Amino acid sequence: STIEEQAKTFLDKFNHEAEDLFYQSSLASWNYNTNITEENVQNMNNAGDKWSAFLKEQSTLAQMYPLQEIQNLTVKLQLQALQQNGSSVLSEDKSKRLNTILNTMSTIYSTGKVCNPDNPQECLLLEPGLNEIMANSLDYNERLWAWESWRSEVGKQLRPLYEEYVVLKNEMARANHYEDYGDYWRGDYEVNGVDGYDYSRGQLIEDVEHTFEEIKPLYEHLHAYVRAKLMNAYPSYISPIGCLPAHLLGDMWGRFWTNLYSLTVPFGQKPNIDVTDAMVDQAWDAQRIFKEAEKFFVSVGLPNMTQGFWENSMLTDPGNVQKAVCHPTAWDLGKGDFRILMCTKVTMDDFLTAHHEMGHIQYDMAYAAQPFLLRNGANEGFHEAVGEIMSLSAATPKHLKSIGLLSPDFQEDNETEINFLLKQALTIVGTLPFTYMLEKWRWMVFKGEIPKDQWMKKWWEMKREIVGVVEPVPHDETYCDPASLFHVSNDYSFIRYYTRTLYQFQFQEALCQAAKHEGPLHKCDISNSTEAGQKLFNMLRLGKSEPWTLALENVVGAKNMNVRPLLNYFEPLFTWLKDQNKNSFVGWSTDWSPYA
């Protein structure tokens, strides 16, 4: 018979048992993540194993059909997925090692405990112990103890393993004819053979960079101000012309400066925009917040949630009896089954999270219209950008006033506006230079530009030069400061956070233009806009069926990521910040450190 048909016969046989197994695994996984039991783990494993096996046998069987002999664009994509994502590229023993390495590297980030010197018996873990200090503490020495204790008591257990990981990962990537594991990773952003919408893996590096050079002005001026204030909190520790010590940034890694608002607020005199008080005074609850989210999405023409969603989801901590993993997680179990896990709390921050998590469920449902294999996002940065565009609109004064959490006689003043934008930047503009440098390092490491004899040295050279953040104590090659982050120690890409950010502002820039917004983009609520909901829905349904460059053009009128939107969002901040620092020093000594 024809190949293109023998293929259909195979995919049709495959997609049949795929839908069944994916659920069986996605279900037992949920049962565990909600009720941690030996059986729930065993069941989770036995399942994930049977699936991983099915995928492997199907991946092999799939290659039997070449693609040049298939004209049908859709069964092609499907096949490419099963054939291309056919692992086992590494030897049975090498494979077995990299897996054990990954398991051990994760066991030690999660099981990692630093012992308070005061108590050689008492010891703290990243969560909750160490993250609490690195998020709230204002003691330079107490924050530094943890910062070092983390990289010098666990990071050093990783250095050896991460070195072996970089080797086996590069063997597998190069066996697939890929330059390195970093190039393999840029693989996700690649579109080959679609006249008009093509994307090379190297264009991503050129694009991450050229865009970043346009961010320089803003982050430089934010940096200036943040350094000026942090001085008033640590006047014995902070060069008026230097980097920020890597322990004093409101994170264990300085990924977000969200916790440095208490010291950076431009006008602490102005009233807060948090409405956790209103939510409490109106006796809100998880059910209420999520229902309020469904309303925003229906305000734009999207579907209401399923019955199983309000029936099988876990939006409240099960309590002591059932032990659960409280990480805001949106599931797709397959077979129209969708649930959300969130130990929700009555707070403005947990209300906005729900809108983001719910955008994921909308997407998961939006592309159920696609076959199992194209039932994914255009890129690893698309799903996140979606969830974020909601919280961007949900946390607007317009939306809050009309939800009845902000008094309808509230005053949107320049002064309150700036408090908002600034807090936004600390979480947005701040994590950008942090994310770019981290991946840029991992790429260079996987490419081979950085020898193991200068891994940490380059890590801090880059942190200084790119991120204007210096280490408080000098570190040799015994340390693995980068590996001290879950993503790196858990084998996960990180540029997804650089990309999603640029897309979300472009998405809002358009969805607002769709809602005929008048003025500054930051006060834009797309609620009650069917036109905008449709344009986004157009892309949401495509899923993993078309070039991400096309998905973008469908909603933006342009085919590549672009920063000009993001710059218009914070433009009022930028302009005020320039003025603030008119009598401050901007930029930084790479050389200066705390230990000079």
């Binding site: 994916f22 695994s25 996605s26 996984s29 565990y32 993540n33 783990v41 989770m44 494993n45 994930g48 991983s52 995928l55 997925a81 099963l82 994502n85 692992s87 990954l102 398991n103 590297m105 994760s106 066991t107 999660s110 993993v325 990480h327 805001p328 997680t329 949106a330 599931w331 797709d332 179990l333 397959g334 998590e357 994921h360 998961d364 199992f372 294999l373 039932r375 994914n376 799903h383 969830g387 879950f486 993503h487 858990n490 084998d491 996960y492």
Partner: peptide, 17 residues
């Protein structure tokens, strides 16, 4: 080594799948 994501979080490699 994974086509469809069975949820939107990046779970600990340890105990998962």
């Amino acid at each position: 080594a994974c086509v469809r994501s069975h949820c939107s979080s990046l779970l600990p490699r340890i105990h998962c799948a």
